[PDB]
Design a protein around this ligand. Structure first.
Ligand SMILES: [Mg+2]
Ligand SMILES: [Mg+2]
Ligand SMILES: [Mg+2]
Ligand SMILES: [Mg+2]
Ligand SMILES: [Mg+2]
Ligand SMILES: [Mg+2]
Ligand SMILES: [Mg+2]
Ligand SMILES: [Zn+2]
Lengths: 295, 110, 174, 246, 166, 153
């Protein structure tokens, strides 16, 4: 198909908004749900929220600004939940921060979110004369050097390793994305509709089908911030501006008998947990090394 | 010495609102992880310490009733036991303080 | 964004505070010991002495005082000045500093990385040396230029020479 | 130098001043309701039946002994009183009383509603803006029961009439800043009420005044509010620990 | 005496037509006859201008001034009015739009020095005024950049006309 | 010019300085946890550290008994020092007491308070500032360096 980069982004935004309106129209009347706060700090608090339009961030706004800024992931019952995905049914809520003794759930979400930011920067950095295909964001533990994102480039761009300036160019663009405040939007979209969003990308269609096989309902999760739409597993941090230190470490080559995937690795730290300059440089060097963990 | 002329309000406003004389903001305010109240980074929580101080007063009040004299002090170690507990083998040979309330969560038995 | 103040030890766990101290300490010894070959790391050319030439001074630490006696029986008091860590930091061309003599920069004793500015730490990272306490500017002629990063020792001064001393005096307040 | 402050306001009451009133306080209407009518739980479904609802309500009027005695008491105290014409007068009073709140006219409302009913419909909406309208009446009003009380202290007799009305209304409450608060404007919601009226019989004037509003216990819950509320948790003193009821 | 700040809460605006921008809430509250002085109270009021209610309370929590506790009580009781008397949800979504300190009624006394002399002593009373507006706090203005100064100066040189020309 | 002066001027002079610390030290021994002004508590820490050192000397040493006689103004605390505090502290050398900054006193003076206590006291623990757990995001990244460093070296 003959679609310019501006048009294909506009088409996806139109499709995503159309799906969002359909979900809102499925609830004709505002329904009141009673949410009991089971957090350690303020037990016994009962919230009376609206169905499918009230997010846990709006739930946190009732308490104080401290819950608005410290909280990252909300715990609906026993399931992790984003702070911008609207609630569905009456349940119990708990807020998890970095300072908690078990930030493992929050650490995984932050690592996933930073990978998505790199994909947006990589996709909209190459010239339109080259084709960029985003494959996926492999799940690597935080104990590893850094988060990695897999990108397939053009065939005529096979013999090209980015230079130091080119690697730093991605970081500057990422920081510009950090400078503007863009919330993360989570939407549940049916599998066939998701295939329409990523029609151009062959690899994304395969990723959607694989994810849809794990759920009997053929339901997938889509996350959008700004004008970029991507499919990812698990929740994400509520706000883009949570990241403070961001850097693209280096690239690596993984050659398969069918295609070549470029592995972009970068290391980031949040505002709350920013480190010293001496410690940051030590951690940055370890991020240069190859990361190999898929299954 | 005495002033020569009345200070104009224009001069007074400059002096009374100088950045030095203004109140400086504090950027070291944090929420206490245990109780969720406010405290500074280098200062113990006011609410949590007040919780401990009230309990400490009750324990000391019980000790006073166990030593009537003003110059009576134990020659051995002291162990505090709450309701539903009995002294251990390592705790024998020490004075026992009994409290009716249930053992608080923050207090840890050894 | 009212970002809260932070320090290096704020977010470090008890199991990592000793590790970080070990990590920085080992880097200092490796960096200092790698500069101990000034004439084996391609130094700048050395020119013969000429009249009116000026040499490079040092930065030392004042230990204390001792009495000293000469062969004629007189008594003198000497001050013990120790050179702990002295390295030339940067070289300024003749026409960019004064227009008559070049400037050579000399650092002080080693200090901790965790209490210096971002620019100061970044400057030393490029050179590959631990941060210094005090930095002074020396006026040196073009025939006595030293490649930055060359260590200096107390043997730079031979006995029998007359030297100057510049330092902040004892502050007695108001 | 010897100047001090005055005007400290406090409200103190004692039994002695209340018992020394030269003229006793005159009450236009009684405070409470003598008896609360208990409608059957099936009225939500009988209301859709025309013949069954009218016939059953008619029998209840003609079979109650106490109600018929009260009706005769009103007739003896004041002639030219008809039960049949009462609901039409009651229906018009109900419409006029609420339209007064729309226009915020308290002078007319005092004649329509009684002393015990005025604070309930005025206190909460004092600084707000409400818009109430009447569109349709699906079922004509019927008289439920009539009761009377004889206070031998002064011989005052009050006649309470309970009327069941099925009303179609459009309620919308606006915030003092002009933003919508409770309901929309174009939705004709169906509502059922048991309005209790009251008239002073000894008084030669004796206007018919609305006394109270009875809501059945099984009535459907009202439409949800637009604003989100939070119930605060139990305030805890430092020496008290939280306990979770189950 | 004058009491007009209290009466600002009784203003009823006409209902807004659909499609108009949402009107932010405005809450007026004050306390009369505070024993604290007028000038000392002003510094506390200047501190909390333009900040959200949650961080305004945090700053006044640890302030050592006697009036810090007085102002914190005023803000807390004004917040309850906003969420109950007014239809303001998200009790943390308020910012202090305006705060100031006025002077109350003084009591005159006699202060003794010696040699039979005296001086008039003025017992000091002050008022506190606070206005809370629903919404995030406005962003503080940054200093003019280098381009901003150059643009104004070039514009100024372009406005020049021949004085007493014709 | 106060160069090199490690002591502080308290009370009505050098003699009143000792007596003020004499009463505080007596309260610290009997109760094992007292709170006072931060400046006065800081001075009291030095004496409390060395008083235990005199206790370790023994009940028979004459100098220790005379030194404890002056500081323990209440005479029923001397047996406690040589039979409770001293036997308890045998392992550590200088970690006898803790000092933490209590928030300012809720009074007019608004003094800077501090809490001083002995190790292993029979009282509820103070809310000590707990460090971040090793599971934090920053700690996890640093632990990766340690595992890799120990794997090669
Ligand atoms: Mg000095
Ligand atoms: Mg006299
Ligand atoms: Mg005068
Ligand atoms: Mg005066
Ligand atoms: Mg000193
Ligand atoms: Mg003094
Ligand atoms: Mg000290
Ligand atoms: Zn606390």
């Amino acid at each position: 198909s003959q679609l310019s980069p501006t048009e294909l982004i506009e088409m996806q935004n139109d499709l995503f908004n159309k799906e969002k309106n359909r979900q809102l129209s499925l609830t004709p009347r505002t329904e009141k749900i009673e949410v009991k706060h089971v957090g350690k700090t303020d037990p016994g608090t009962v919230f009376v929220m609206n169905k499918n339009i009230s997010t846990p961030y709006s739930c946190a706004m009732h308490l104080s600004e401290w819950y608005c800024r410290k909280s990252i992931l909300a715990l609906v019952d026993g399931q992790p939940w984003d702070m911008y995905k609207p609630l569905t049914k009456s349940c119990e809520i708990k807020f998890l921060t970095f300072k908690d003794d078990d930030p493992g759930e929050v650490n995984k979400a932050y690592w996933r979110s930073c990978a998505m930011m790199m994909g947006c920067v990589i996709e909209r950095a190459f010239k339109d004369e080259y084709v960029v295909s985003l494959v996926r964001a492999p799940e690597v533990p935080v104990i590893a050097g850094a988060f990695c994102y897999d990108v397939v480039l053009d065939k005529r761009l096979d013999e090209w390793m980015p230079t130091k300036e080119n690697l730093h160019s991605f970081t500057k663009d990422a920081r510009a994305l950090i400078y503007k405040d863009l919330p993360f939007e989570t939407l549940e979209v049916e599998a066939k509709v998701a295939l329409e969003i990523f029609q151009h990308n062959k690899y994304k269609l395969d990723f959607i089908e694989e994810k849809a096989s794990q759920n009997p309902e053929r339901i997938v999760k889509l996350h959008r911030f700004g004008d970029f739409i991507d499919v990812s597993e698990g929740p994400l941090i509520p706000r883009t501006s949570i990241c403070f230190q961001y850097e693209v470490s280096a690239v690596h080559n993984l050659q398969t008998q069918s295609s070549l995937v470029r592995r972009f690795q970068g290391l980031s730290l949040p505002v709350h947990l920013r480190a010293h300059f001496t410690i940051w440089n030590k951690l940055l060097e370890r991020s240069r090394k190859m990361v190999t963990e898929d299954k | 010495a005495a002033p020569k002329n009345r200070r104009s309000i224009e001069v007074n406003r400059c002096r009374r609102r100088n950045p030095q004389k203004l109140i400086k903001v504090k950027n070291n305010i944090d929420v206490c992880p245990e109780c969720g109240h406010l405290k500074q980074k280098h200062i113990l929580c006011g609410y949590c310490y007040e919780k401990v101080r009230k309990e400490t007063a009750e324990i000391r009040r019980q000790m006073g009733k166990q030593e009537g004299g003003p110059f009576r002090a134990p020659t051995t170690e002291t162990v505090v036991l709450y309701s539903g507990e009995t002294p251990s083998e390592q705790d024998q040979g020490k004075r026992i303080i009994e409290r009716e309330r249930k053992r608080p969560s923050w207090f840890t038995q050894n | 964004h009212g970002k809260s103040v932070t320090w290096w030890d704020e977010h470090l766990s008890e199991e990592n505070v000793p590790f970080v101290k070990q990590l920085v300490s080992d880097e200092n010894k490796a960096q200092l010991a790698s500069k101990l070959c000034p004439l084996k790391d391609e130094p700048w050319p050395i020119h013969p002495w000429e009249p009116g030439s000026s040499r490079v001074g040092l930065i030392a630490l004042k230990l204390g005082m001792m009495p000293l006696w000469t062969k004629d029986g007189q008594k003198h008091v000497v001050t013990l000045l120790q050179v702990q860590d002295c390295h030339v930091l940067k070289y300024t061309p003749k026409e960019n500093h004064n227009g008559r003599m070049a400037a050579l920069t000399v650092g002080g004793k080693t200090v901790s990385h965790f209490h210096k500015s971002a620019s100061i730490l970044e400057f030393y990272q490029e050179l590959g040396l631990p941060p210094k306490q005090k930095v002074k500017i020396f006026n040196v002629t073009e025939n006595a230029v030293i490649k930055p990063g060359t260590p200096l020792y107390a043997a730079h001064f031979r006995p029998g020479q007359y030297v100057d001393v510049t330092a902040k005096t004892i502050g007695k307040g108001f | 130098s010897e100047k001090e402050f005055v005007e400290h306001a406090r409200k103190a009451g004692l039994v002695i001043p209340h018992e020394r009133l030269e003229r006793p306080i005159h009450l236009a209407c009684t405070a409470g309701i003598f008896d609360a009518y208990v409608p059957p739980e099936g009225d939500a479904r009988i209301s859709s039946l025309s013949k069954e609802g009218l016939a059953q309500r008619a029998e209840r009027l003609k079979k109650n002994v106490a109600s018929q005695l009260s009706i005769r008491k009103i007739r003896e105290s004041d002639p030219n009183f008809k039960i049949k014409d009462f609901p039409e007068k009651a229906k018009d009073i109900f419409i006029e009383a609420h339209l007064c709140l729309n226009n915020s006219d308290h002078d007319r409302l005092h004649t329509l509603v009684t002393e015990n009913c005025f604070p309930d419909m005025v206190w909460d909406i004092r600084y707000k803006t409400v818009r109430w309208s009447f569109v349709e009446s699906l079922e004509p009003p019927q008289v439920v029961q009539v009761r009377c009380s004889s206070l031998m202290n002064q011989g005052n007799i009050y006649g309470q009439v309970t009327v069941r009305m099925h009303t179609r209304q459009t309620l919308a409450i606006y915030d003092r800043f002009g933003r919508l608060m409770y309901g929309q404007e174009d939705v004709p919601r169906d509502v059922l009420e048991y309005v209790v009226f009251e008239k002073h019989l000894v008084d030669p004037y004796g206007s018919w005044r609305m006394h109270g509003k009875i809501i059945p216990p099984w009535a459907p819950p009202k439409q949800p509010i637009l604003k989100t509320v939070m119930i605060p948790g139990p305030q805890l003193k430092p020496w008290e620990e939280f306990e979770e009821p189950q | 005496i004058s009491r007009k700040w209290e009466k600002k809460n009784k203003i009823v605006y006409p209902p807004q037509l659909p499609g108009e921008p949402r009107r932010p809430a405005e809450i007026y509250h004050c306390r009369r006859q505070i024993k604290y002085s007028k000038d000392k109270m002003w510094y506390l009021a200047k501190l909390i201008r333009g900040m959200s209610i949650d961080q305004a309370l945090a700053q006044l929590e640890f302030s050592d001034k006697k009036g810090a506790q007085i102002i914190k009580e005023v803000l807390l009781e004004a917040q309850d009015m906003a969420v109950r008397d007014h239809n303001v949800e998200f009790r943390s979504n308020l910012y202090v739009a305006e705060s100031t300190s006025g002077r109350g009624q003084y009591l005159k006394r006699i202060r003794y020095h010696g040699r039979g002399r005296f001086g008039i002593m003025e017992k000091v009373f002050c008022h506190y005024f606070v206005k809370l507006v629903e919404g995030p706090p406005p962003p503080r203005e940054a200093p003019k950049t280098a381009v901003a100064h150059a643009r104004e100066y070039i514009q100024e040189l372009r406005n020049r006309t021949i004085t007493h020309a014709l | 010019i106060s160069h090199g002066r490690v002591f502080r001027r308290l009370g009505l002079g050098p003699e009143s300085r000792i007596h003020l610390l004499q009463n505080l030290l007596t309260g610290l021994v009997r109760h094992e946890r007292i709170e006072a002004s931060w400046a006065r508590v800081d001075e009291l820490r030095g004496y409390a550290e060395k008083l235990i050192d005199y206790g370790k000397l023994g009940d028979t040493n004459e100098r220790a008994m005379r030194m404890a006689d002056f500081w323990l103004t209440e005479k029923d605390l001397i047996p406690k020092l040589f039979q409770v505090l001293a036997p308890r502290f045998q392992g550590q050398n200088g970690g006898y007491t803790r000092m933490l900054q209590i928030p300012n006193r809720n009074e007019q003076d608004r003094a800077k308070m501090a809490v001083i206590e002995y190790k292993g006291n029979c009282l509820p623990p103070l809310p000590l500032p707990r460090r971040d757990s090793n599971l934090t995001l920053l700690n996890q990244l640093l632990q990766g360096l340690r595992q890799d460093q120990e794997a090669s070296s």
